Design a protein around this ligand. Structure first.
Ligand SMILES: NCCCN[C@H]1CC[C@H](N)CC1
Ligand SMILES: NCCCN[C@H]1CC[C@H](N)CC1
Lengths: 271, 271
């Protein structure tokens, strides 16, 4: 059998590879190359421009932490925006909250959504929920155009003007979490991201998620708060039957994810 | 340039690769194949039987956590044993403690030690400390033969009889920490290891370390206590000048490393 290998100038000198049991789908969309394959040991894999987007075996780690960190801090979130995230994993976690009344997702490439609906049914199931509204659209145009404000915005996608638009689209006590780089390779980028956020948000925090199929085995969450209390401590426990199946997130893990290695703390305490 | 690739039946279906700037040394010892190369982005790399043992860029994560977790819990450790660990990283962290009077290291393959002394000077520097005594010897024979008991034993190497020997070689309030698998691939093995330890030790805990060049980007520490308080909370802060250069470990990270993902907690609460 052949092997998929993940190369990139963003992590030069290293690569991760998965063994292919069988290729399922391949296309070039208007925006990116799309590959779906069944791996031998990580279940199905989604690849965009040769970079792994998710695998069945571990996606719960990233989707649970990205969603339940902000959603357990926000008191009674009613309206939530997902930027990027065509695969639907965040939306699947969001639908577990009965308080939520509306979920907007903005994804520029509908092929991602369609491929996820077809090949990743246990990840894209949230799309069948009546609260979920899909916008095939560039996120800057969406954010500039939306009239509603959001309690939580979750940026599930790899700019200082952009974070102004996020801030304006948030309620007064709203929160934004954004995917934000591995601490093992792009500390310079993390510093820039915290710098951009701190000009607008009064509380900017960084958490780490362990996930083996992202480069270096982990990925950060940039956490932006308009209030002074920040996002490190949940205000609620996920006890109802909808959360009985959670596989990574729990009340203790939430806080622990913000306890960073000493070298990173040193780089970012002076920003 | 060529690429080193790390394959193994222990993690089937996946592989990690580093780009080679230049090969430095290669031999077959009595016990294993030994490769040393300068990578393009992780500095120098030590490989044993085709499995990465360490790299300069990230070794501090594993050596700091393996050492300072037990050494900040033990009140006044005087005698410490390192099993395996020919590369010297643990010993380098141990020498920072002025209270320590003796450090025994037991390593079956002296080539490892010699290669580390030659090619990894910032990792093997502890060998020049007068407290350090080297035994080229199988660890089961060493543990069966030693007359001293230890305050801390650090098993830096990839068996129920073996943990009996560890228990007997420890002081009444002594501690053992052992390298113990990635939670992303060998949960069955972690369960067995905790099972073996719990028959002898009254407190058996599991912590996670983020380190990108180990498979799945992380590696566990099996933590065994003879006292009931366990190893999750340090009894001291590392404030003296010897610890000013620490790059991963800190007082908060210590406890956070024991906050495990929900699926692992579920597998190991019933053992
Ligand atoms: N298409 C891959 C997932 C991320 N999608 C986002 C869609 C909206 C864009 N403004 C940014 C990427
Ligand atoms: N040689 C590689 C590092 C681990 N070395 C250990 C030496 C002692 C043995 N009983 C187990 C492996």
């Amino acid at each position: 059998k052949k092997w998929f290998s993940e190369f990139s100038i963003m992590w030069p000198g290293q690569a991760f590879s998965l063994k292919i049991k069988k290729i399922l789908y391949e296309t070039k969309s208007k925006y990116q190359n799309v590959l779906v394959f069944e791996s031998t040991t990580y279940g199905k894999v989604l690849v965009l421009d040769g970079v792994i987007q998710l695998t069945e075996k571990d996606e719960f780690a990233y989707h649970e932490m990205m969603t339940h960190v902000p959603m357990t801090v926000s008191k009674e979130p009613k309206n939530v925006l997902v930027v990027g995230g065509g695969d639907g994993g965040i939306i699947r976690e969001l639908c577990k909250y009965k308080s939520v009344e509306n979920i907007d997702i903005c994804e520029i490439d509908e092929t991602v959504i369609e491929v996820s609906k077809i090949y990743f049914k246990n990840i894209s199931c949230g799309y069948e929920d009546k609260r979920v509204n899909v916008f095939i659209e560039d996120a800057s145009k969406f954010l500039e155009n939306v009239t509603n404000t959001y309690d939580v915005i979750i940026v599930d996608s790899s700019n200082q003007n952009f974070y102004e638009k996020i801030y304006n689209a948030l309620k007064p006590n709203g929160y934004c979490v954004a995917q934000c780089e591995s601490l093992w390779i792009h500390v310079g980028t993390i510093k820039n991201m915290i710098g951009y956020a701190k000009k607008l948000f009064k509380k900017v925090e960084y958490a780490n998620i362990s996930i083996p199929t992202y480069p270096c085995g982990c990925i950060g969450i940039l956490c932006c708060s308009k209030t002074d209390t920040g996002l490190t401590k949940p205000n609620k426990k996920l006890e109802s039957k909808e959360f009985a199946d959670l596989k990574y997130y729990n009340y203790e893990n939430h806080s622990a994810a913000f306890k960073l290695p000493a070298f990173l703390l040193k780089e970012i305490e002076n920003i």
